[PDB]
From TrEMBL, chain F:
BP terms from Gene Ontology: cytoplasmic translation; ribosomal small subunit assembly; translation
SUPFAM superfamilies named in the record: Zn-binding ribosomal proteins
Protein name: 40S ribosomal protein S27
InterPro entries registered for this protein in UniProt: Ribosomal_eS27, Ribosomal_eS27_Zn-bd_dom_sf, Ribosomal_zn-bd
Keyword Zinc-finger: yes
GO terms of molecular function: RNA binding; structural constituent of ribosome; zinc ion binding
Tree of life domain: Eukaryota
Annotated keywords: Metal-binding, Ribonucleoprotein, Ribosomal protein, Zinc, Zinc-finger
Family stated for the protein in its record: Belongs to the eukaryotic ribosomal protein eS27 family.
Name of the coding gene: RpS27
Cofactor: Zn(2+)
PROSITE patterns: RIBOSOMAL_S27E
Record's cofactor remark: Binds 1 zinc ion per subunit.
Species: Drosophila melanogaster
Length: 152, 62, 134, 107, 91, 84, 220
RNA sequence: UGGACCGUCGUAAGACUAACUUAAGCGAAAGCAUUUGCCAAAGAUGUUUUCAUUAAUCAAGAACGAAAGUUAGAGGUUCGAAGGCGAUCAGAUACCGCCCUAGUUCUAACCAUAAACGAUGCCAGCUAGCAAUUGGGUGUAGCUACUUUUAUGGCUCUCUCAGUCG
């Protein structure tokens, strides 16, 4: 509550300790519960796994893109959009990408992302239609005003 | 611009206001160039003629 | 034995271009990057109509032949451009006349081709379905 | 005031078919009812042929010609004297005549 | 009888908000909270929770999908797009 | 003659090339033949335009060629134009 | 700006071009390259040069008749103003192209891409034509959309025999005589009479690496 | 002004799928052209298959109809009503140019009209040739092809139905 997007609750068995360790992804599309996710450079491409860019070709779409390899996914995750890559380059390990802006820019390649479109769209095409729902649309996202103009 | 061109064969004109004999002439040192030139005024067959422009003849098909 | 003659035997490219309303004499490298003697008929007669004349094409063909010999070029190749897409696709009247002053200058040349742009399929002319009503 | 029998060209069991524009007017017309002259025209216009034989690198290179199927509309035909004005009866043949010489503009 | 004449399920929200804004929620709420054939449970037991988060009520499989239909036509196209492409990389 | 007096008695061979249907009576060009496949010996009767794969009970050599017309077997057949 | 008072072509120097070894001799002329500087390095501008030559220049065609096989070449590296000038394609001119299509026909077009013994990815453009049988007054000699599409399938398995077919050190020698243009008739004539037929263009879109060890053997 | 237009490789980018194109064909009509796979459906000959009149056409009526053109959501190349500007003209608000704007684009639908024309509704029968050509059959007492004389295959002739053109 505060998103529009749905989350994804998932856990793992540690390569080092004895316990389970619970994490929270952003929902790839078609994620049934009980799906077997995979996270690795050797992990083959199937939605919605998480794999680095150097092992998928162009033409695929992804979500939860990471720019700086380690900072775990700060790009293009919100509802109804899709992280894309349309360029590979084996010179100094480069792969250009198109954000949902349309302005296409360059990222490094060793970083990770989750393959496929991300769930939630499209919550602009249903008009909220009254001043009670778009109260609650800003009940728990921020506290803007139901905003008040300038010229009075 | 100093070559002289002798006539071999004659054809008609787009005459009315400037009758100019579209006419088949060849040179002497350049006698292999039988370029079909356009002389203004009456010309008998067998006349060598001077010339300065020795490039083209503004061809229209006839 | 295997003795090729000195005097810098080379085959340049003409890239002779002609059209209605212009003729272009654009000689370059055989690879095609470096360009020598770009000058054409558009810098010959100041009339804004007579730059389609074969006379101006001849003056565009008078000058370009001798500057090949200033660097020792004695031979070249000849390409043709239309440059029609949905446009003309057929060479202008000054096209065939332009090679004559090249031919009547004792320049030994054999290669005659067109790179006249034949598209895969048309991409729309200008004028729109009732074009150019004279 | 119907004069042609079938009409234009080639509309047997189809309806309405592919157009492409004319070159010298580009009144965009269907591919059947537009005059379609096809020409293999020569490069030097048969006059510089004696000049290129002297300037050839090889034995005359022997000269190619151009190939492009041009497409004319109706007033383009009549405003260049392509095909015009037979009788009320002399519009009833297609296949003849030339009868005299190997046709020019090729040449 | 044919109870209303056009509007159907937005008839709660009547005489309000406009003409072609009463219609635009029709075309997006005759799909939402109708029942769907579950791809796993086989039956027709699909209602919503919030945006894009459907569950069944039978056999407890829950699947994330589209937000006004069960899964969009944008989505399975991608599920078809990564399908044909996956056999090209390692093979 | 276009204004002919005899239609009851036409010439035979032109009727043989007229049609399978438009004759004075109705009988097709088709018949039955008794094919022996050349690698075997067994007797089998089959239609001309059989439109169906036939083999014997134990002699499945060729016996047919799949087509829309008559079963055109080249050098793999032996039969007769005869009611058996 | 620069303001050179005389002869920009003075710095443009005569640089020779050298063929590969297997065709013929290597001197097919010169190129004009600007003289280098410390930051302006003229050797690395030769890599941006795409070069053109015909088989008449590389198989001593005195009367130009087989000159329709026009070869694209790529200048890749130099030594002592002598470029190695690797292959970059082999197209057809428009002269031999447009002369074939006398309307009255059904062409046989086929496009196929494949990977070689080496790391190249060629693009083969199989273009066929129908041969008129004798004693025939019918002015069509047409193919009936299975008489092409099976013939279209007939060439695509032929060409992949030659993509694993001893590449550019040996492959273009099979394209010099065009033995691939010979044997396809004997397969096509089992279905349909085949007229003139060519490949008309090849493409070199995945030249993988320089590989100078066999390439100095190619410059042998 | 110094780098257009030009030559050249290269990156995208969206539209179009020319040539081959026909007095071709498929479709009920509008319309309908890259390959190849897929998923279908129809027509024609083939048929000593089955069925037993299941029929023809049709008010009311239900599917389908290029644009033009609207309703939100994409994506932007050529082009482009409208709008500005140069000429031309007596005037041009136009015929010609330059720029882009609606939009053509593909997805979701919505009107349903066109000279939507072969200015001729559909189904049964007869009456005339001649010549093309599409498919399917059939006869070569045909050649050609070499896998071999063959074989499948091509063309030619003969016959044939549906024709459609002339």
């Amino acid at each position: 509550p505060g998103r529009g997007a749905p989350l994804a609750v998932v856990h793992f068995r540690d390569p080092y300790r004895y316990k389970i360790r619970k994490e929270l992804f952003i929902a790839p599309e078609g994620m049934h519960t009980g799906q077997f996710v995979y996270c690795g450079r050797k992990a083959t491409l199937q939605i919605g796994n998480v794999m680095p860019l150097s092992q998928m070709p162009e033409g695929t779409i992804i979500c939860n893109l990471e720019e700086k390899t380690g900072d775990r996914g700060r790009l293009a995750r919100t509802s109804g959009n899709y992280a894309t890559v349309i360029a590979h380059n084996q010179d100094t390990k480069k792969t250009r990408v198109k954000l949902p802006s349309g302005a296409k820019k360059v990222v490094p390649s060793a970083n990770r992302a989750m393959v496929g479109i991300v769930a939630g769209g499209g919550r602009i095409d249903k008009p909220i239609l009254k001043a009670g729902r778009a109260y609650h649309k800003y009940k728990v996202k921020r506290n803007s005003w139901p905003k008040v103009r300038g010229v009075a | 611009p100093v070559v002289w061109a002798r006539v071999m064969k004659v054809l008609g004109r787009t005459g009315s206001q400037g009758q100019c004999t579209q006419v088949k002439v060849e040179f002497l040192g350049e006698q292999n160039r039988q370029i079909i030139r356009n002389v203004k005024g009456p010309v008998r067959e067998g006349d060598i003629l001077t010339l300065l422009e020795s490039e083209r003849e503004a061809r229209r098909l006839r | 034995g295997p003795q090729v003659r000195d005097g810098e035997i080379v085959f340049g490219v003409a890239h002779i271009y002609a059209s209605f309303n212009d003729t272009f004499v654009h000689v370059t490298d055989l690879s095609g990057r470096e360009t020598i003697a770009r000058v054409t008929g558009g810098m010959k007669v100041k009339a804004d109509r007579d730059e389609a004349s074969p006379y101006a094409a001849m003056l565009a063909a008078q000058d370009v032949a001798e500057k090949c010999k200033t660097l020792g070029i004695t031979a070249l190749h000849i390409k043709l451009r239309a440059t029609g897409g949905n446009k003309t696709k057929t060479p202008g009247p000054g096209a065939q006349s332009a090679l004559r002053a090249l031919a009547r200058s004792s320049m030994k040349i054999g290669r005659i081709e067109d790179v006249t742009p034949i598209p895969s399929d048309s991409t729309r002319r200008k004028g729109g379905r009732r074009g150019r009503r004279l | 005031t119907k004069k042609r029998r079938n009409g234009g060209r080639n509309k047997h069991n189809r309806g309405h078919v592919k157009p492409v524009r004319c070159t010298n007017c580009a009144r965009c017309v269907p591919k059947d009812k537009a005059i379609k002259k096809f020409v293999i025209r020569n490069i030097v216009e048969a006059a510089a042929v004696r000049d290129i034989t002297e300037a050839s690198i090889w034995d005359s290179y022997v000269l190619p010609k151009l190939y492009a199927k041009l497409h004319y509309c109706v007033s383009c035909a009549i405003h260049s004297k392509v095909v015009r004005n037979r009788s009320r009866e002399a519009r009833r043949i297609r296949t003849p005549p030339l009868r005299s010489f190997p046709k020019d503009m090729a040449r | 009888a044919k109870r209303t004449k056009k509007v159907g399920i937005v008839g709660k929200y009547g005489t309000r908000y406009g003409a072609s804004l009463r219609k635009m929620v029709k075309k997006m709420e005759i799909t939402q909270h109708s029942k769907y054939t579950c791809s796993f449970c086989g039956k027709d037991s699909m209602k919503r929770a919030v945006v894009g988060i459907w569950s069944c009520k039978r056999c407890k499989r829950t699947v994330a999908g589209g937000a006004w239909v069960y899964s969009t036509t944008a989505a399975a196209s991608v599920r078809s797009a990564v399908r044909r492409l996956r056999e090209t990389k390692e093979q | 003659m276009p204004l002919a007096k005899d239609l009851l008695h036409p010439l035979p061979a032109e009727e043989k090339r007229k049609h399978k249907l438009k004759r004075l009576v109705q009988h097709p060009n088709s018949y039955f033949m008794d094919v022996k496949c050349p690698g075997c010996y067994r007797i089998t009767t089959v239609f001309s335009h059989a439109q169906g794969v036939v083999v014997c009970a134990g002699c499945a050599t060729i016996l047919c060629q799949p087509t829309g017309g008559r079963a055109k077997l080249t050098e793999g057949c032996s039969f007769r134009r005869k009611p058996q | 700006g620069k303001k050179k008072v005389v002869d920009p072509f003075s710095r443009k120097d005569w640089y020779d071009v050298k063929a590969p070894n297997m065709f013929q001799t290597r001197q097919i002329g010169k190129t004009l390259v600007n003289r280098t500087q410390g930051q302006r390095i003229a050797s690395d501008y030769l890599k941006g040069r795409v070069f053109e030559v015909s088989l008449a220049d590389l198989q001593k065609d005195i009367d130009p008749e087989r000159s329709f096989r026009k070869f694209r070449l790529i200048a890749e590296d130099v030594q002592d103003r002598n470029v190695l000038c690797n292959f970059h394609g082999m197209d057809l001119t428009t002269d031999k192209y447009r002369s074939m299509v006398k309307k009255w026909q059904t062409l046989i077009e086929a496009i196929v891409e494949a990977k070689t013994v080496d790391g190249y990815l060629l693009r083969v453009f199989c273009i066929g034509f129908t041969a008129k049988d004798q004693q025939s007054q019918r002015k069509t000699c047409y193919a009936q959309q299975s008489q092409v599409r099976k013939i279209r399938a007939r060439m695509t398995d032929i060409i992949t025999n030659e993509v694993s077919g001893a590449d550019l050190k040996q492959l273009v020698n099979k394209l010099a005589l065009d033995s691939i243009a010979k044997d396809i008739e004997k397969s096509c004539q089992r279905i349909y009479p085949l007229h003139d037929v060519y490949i008309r263009k090849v493409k070199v879109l995945k030249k993988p690496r320089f590989d100078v060890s066999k390439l100095l053997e190619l410059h042998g």
